[PDB]
Amino acid sequence: VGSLNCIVAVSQNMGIGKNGDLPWPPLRNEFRYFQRMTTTSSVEGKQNLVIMGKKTWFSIPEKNRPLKGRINLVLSRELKEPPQGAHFLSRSLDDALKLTEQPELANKVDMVWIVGGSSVYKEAMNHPGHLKLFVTRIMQDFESDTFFPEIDLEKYKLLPEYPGVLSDVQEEKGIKYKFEVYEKND
Numbered sequence: 001v002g003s004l005n006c007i008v009a010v011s012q013n014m015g016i017g018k019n020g021d022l023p024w025p026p027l028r029n030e031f032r033y034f035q036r037m038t039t040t041s042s043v044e045g046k047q048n049l050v051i052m053g054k055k056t057w058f059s060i061p062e063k064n065r066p067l068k069g070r071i072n073l074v075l076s077r078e079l080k081e082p083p084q085g086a087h088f089l090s091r092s093l094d095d096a097l098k099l100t101e102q103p104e105l106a107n108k109v110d111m112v113w114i115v116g117g118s119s120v121y122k123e124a125m126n127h128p129g130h131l132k133l134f135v136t137r138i139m140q141d142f143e144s145d146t147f148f149p150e151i152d153l154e155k156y157k158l159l160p161e162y163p164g165v166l167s168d169v170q171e172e173k174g175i176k177y178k179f180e181v182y183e184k185n186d
């Protein structure tokens, strides 16, 4: 694996979660963007891998688990096997990435997407090598109990535009947001 991707939507006050769900009402096109980015493989015959923490797994409505069209991996130190419906379980991000190279997954994974929550993002963003962060900036404060770590501009550059990502401010249900892409190479 030569590259990792993180994807997150975050409020102006750095919130990503409230009470096991999103802090804001459902935004259909923002969800479709999440679906498109995490699902689209560039290699016919391979699927992308999604890596998430345990609470994020359980925040997905049961009827939609595992996330369709993607290999679902859950991180937990306490669990001894994957939650029902999840494809894989690892004790750390490092263990998850090594798994991609073992025989079960060897030629099955295209891109790797980190989909939260807070501690998974923190570790991934510090992982060596090339990383892209797809950050949706929800331009309103929302009451939250789970937060996104601040992006270190010593490491990450905000890319001005990016192929495949809309640049203009979006609006759904009266909530303005914008898609950002950050990158580090090392």
Ligand SMILES: NC(=O)C1=CN([C@@H]2O[C@H](COP(=O)(O)OP(=O)(O)OC[C@H]3O[C@@H](n4cnc5c(N)ncnc54)[C@H](OP(=O)(O)O)[C@@H]3O)[C@@H](O)[C@H]2O)C=CC1
Pocket (backbone or CB within 6 Å): 007, 008, 009, 010, 015, 016, 017, 018, 019, 020, 021, 022, 052, 053, 054, 055, 056, 057, 059, 075, 076, 077, 078, 079, 090, 091, 092, 093, 115, 116, 117, 118, 119, 120, 123, 146
């Ligand atoms: N706005 C957004 O883009 C997103 C929002 N969310 C929201 O965030 C909240 C859930 O996220 P959060 O509360 O941060 O919890 P997590 O999804 O990160 O789950 C936490 C648990 O995951 C395991 N875990 C987390 N990080 C690691 C790690 N780096 N290595 C090994 N195991 C790890 C641990 O499990 P154990 O205790 O078993 O060891 C930990 O207790 C929900 O409200 C959800 O709706 C989540 C993702 C995205």
Ligand SMILES: CCc1nc(N)nc(N)c1C#C[C@@H](C)c1cc(OC)cc(-c2cccc3cnccc23)c1
Pocket (backbone or CB within 6 Å): 007, 008, 009, 022, 030, 031, 034, 035, 056, 059, 060, 061, 064, 067, 068, 115, 116, 134, 136
């Ligand atoms: C806020 C949605 C979102 N946006 C971005 N840009 N990045 C993200 N990581 C997320 C997210 C998220 C997680 C927590 C999440 C929550 C959630 O609550 C309902 C649903 C999904 C999800 C992801 C993919 C397909 C799904 C199909 N059905 C239900 C849920 C699906 C995924």
